[PDB]
C-alpha cells in the first residue's frame, strides 16, 4: 500500500492557464498543480497497464470550450473523487505514473 490521501480543494492558475491544485497528504504534506488534460493522459496511461479496472472514470473531454475556469470548478469534485479512488485501488498501489502525477509542481 502507498496510501497517500488527497483533496482537490480548489482550481487555480499559471496566469496566461487554469489548473487543479491537488492537495496531497501522508506527517508529510504537499500540493501539485495538474491540468485538465493530464488526468486524461494519466488515465490513458494507467488503464493501459493495470488489470481491468473501472470504479474510477473520467467524464469525456469536452471540446466545446470555453475550457475556462468555471468549467474546471465544475469538475473539481469528480476529479477529486477519481483521484481518491485510484489510491484505494489495488494493483495501482505502486504505480510510478500515479506518483509522478501527485509529485510536487
From Swiss-Prot:
Localization annotation: Lysosome membrane; Late endosome membrane; Cell projection, Dendrite
Annotated tissue distribution: Widely expressed both in fetal and adult tissues.
Range of residues in the leader sequence: none
PX domain sequence ranges: 9-105
Entry coiled-coil feature ranges: none
Family membership: Belongs to the sorting nexin family.
Purpose of the protein: Plays a role in maintaining normal neuronal excitability and synaptic transmission. May be involved in several stages of intracellular trafficking. Required for autophagosome clearance, possibly by mediating the fusion of lysosomes with autophagosomes. Binds phosphatidylinositol 3,5-bisphosphate (PtdIns(3,5)P2), a key component of late endosomes/lysosomes. Does not bind phosphatidylinositol 3-phosphate (PtdIns(3P)).
Pathological condition linked to this protein in its record: Spinocerebellar ataxia, autosomal recessive, 20: A form of spinocerebellar ataxia, a clinically and genetically heterogeneous group of cerebellar disorders due to degeneration of the cerebellum with variable involvement of the brainstem and spinal cord. SCAR20 is characterized by cerebellar atrophy, ataxia, coarsened facial features, severely delayed psychomotor development with poor or absent speech, and intellectual disability.
Designated name of the protein: Sorting nexin-14
Organism: Homo sapiens (Human)
Full-protein residues shown: 562 to 686 of 946
